[PDB]
Symmetry: D2
Subunit: 142 residues, 4 copies
């Protein structure tokens, strides 16, 4: 059993990103999302699965999906932005198990990642605890 506990930081008062979706991939006995002490907690039944969070800023027509998981006993993460309306977290979560470019992101087993949207705003995941059963990450909205 793994947990990934996520702290969300919204760093600029320009626009407002709100949570809109949280998904669980089906591998390794699946997993759950819990809110715990102001954090988003992804619990997974083993290595080889993941969960996604989608955030939307309707003020500025911006959005992103942040995905967190464990691949071969090492944590991984990715962010997808410039989302079409068809790119919900349900859709994006699954792409990490069949789409080569997404597969590669997972295989990278990154402790940190960033990507910018077409509007120039950057998003980042930073694992602050990178080892063990109880992993911790910052999700930073630029």
């Amino acid at each position: 059993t793994y947990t990934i506990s996520i702290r969300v930081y919204q760093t600029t008062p320009k626009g407002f990103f709100r949570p809109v979706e949280r998904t669980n991939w089906k591998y390794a006995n699946g997993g759950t999302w819990d809110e715990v002490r102001g954090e988003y907690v992804l619990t997974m039944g083993g290595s080889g699965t993941s969960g996604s969070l989608r955030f939307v800023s309707s003020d500025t027509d911006e959005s992103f999906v942040a995905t967190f998981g464990v691949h071969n006993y090492k944590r991984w993460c990715d962010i997808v932005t410039n989302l079409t309306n068809e790119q919900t977290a349900l859709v994006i979560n699954q792409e990490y198990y069949g789409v080569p470019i997404r597969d590669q992101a997972r295989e990278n087993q990154l402790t940190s990642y960033n990507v910018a949207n077409a509007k120039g705003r950057r998003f980042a995941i930073e694992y602050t605890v990178t080892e063990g059963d109880n992993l911790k990450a910052n999700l930073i909205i630029g």
Copy 2:
């Protein structure tokens, strides 16, 4: 644009079901989940899509996925229980758009649905507003 506002009634202090997942299907320009005044609000960009909520009772090894949507401009719902660990909301939500036994439930455009798990616990969805752009439903856990 459609909304479905959901009030959750957990009626029996035997076990405890907690929210663990909320998904959005990709059709009809997708959708979002919001928490508003203690209610779950599914917003959708048109007719032909849906969203799912999974709840889990860890104390009693119970779980269910409740799905809400609009099909051909009429609201629909379904509940799936007796879940395997591989049946996350991500999985179940998507099955309503390709799996015949799930497709048919969606096509029924039901204003109410009730089901029991193997342990005899009943789960129900009852729409209280069944027409118009802003729909309302009770989710009742027995």
Copy 3:
């Protein structure tokens, strides 16, 4: 350090009670309220303090304040209903440290309590774990 973890059960689809306020009394180094895995968690820095939750049903003009605490190393609880608009949780929480009838409720160190409003609806607190540092209770809305 004590925690009291509270599971809220709303048992009838008649009206809808939503959370509106959560307060902490100042004794024993104060305390906090956290949402953890769908539960309300009151953490307190020792014996001799408490915290309150207020719920409101605007559909039916009903409300109540449920208070939980530890007095002389034994848990206690009370519910106040038939609230005036001036009876917020902030007000009610404090009354257990100066108002004789409220003082008495606290001194009772009850594992369970119930009270009905003028509309005939009953509310109950039931401690399921009554001893130790990590206490658990059901808040049942009739």
Copy 4:
């Protein structure tokens, strides 16, 4: 009836402030706290009351209470930090109605306020809508 909708911006991934308390003062027919689309919404029954939010960073031994209200039909705000353990939101909210150094802050009817704690961290409230029945404010944690 007044509303104040609050967007929280936690801007620095050094420490983590989590919500721990939300209180309502008793004047002007009281009020409520709601979570709406990722925002905190304080609703009040008239002019002359307020509500408080306490946030705590356990990692860094930091905390603050942010208070929002309407005084003589104009919005007001204040932040208190460097809190003792006895200074819960319940305590602080009430002090704005009898304690001179707090009364004066309320009477200032400020559209913006900023303060630093002993460790040098800045906290700010900035109203984005300053007139009418439905007010809006950013709460910025530095």
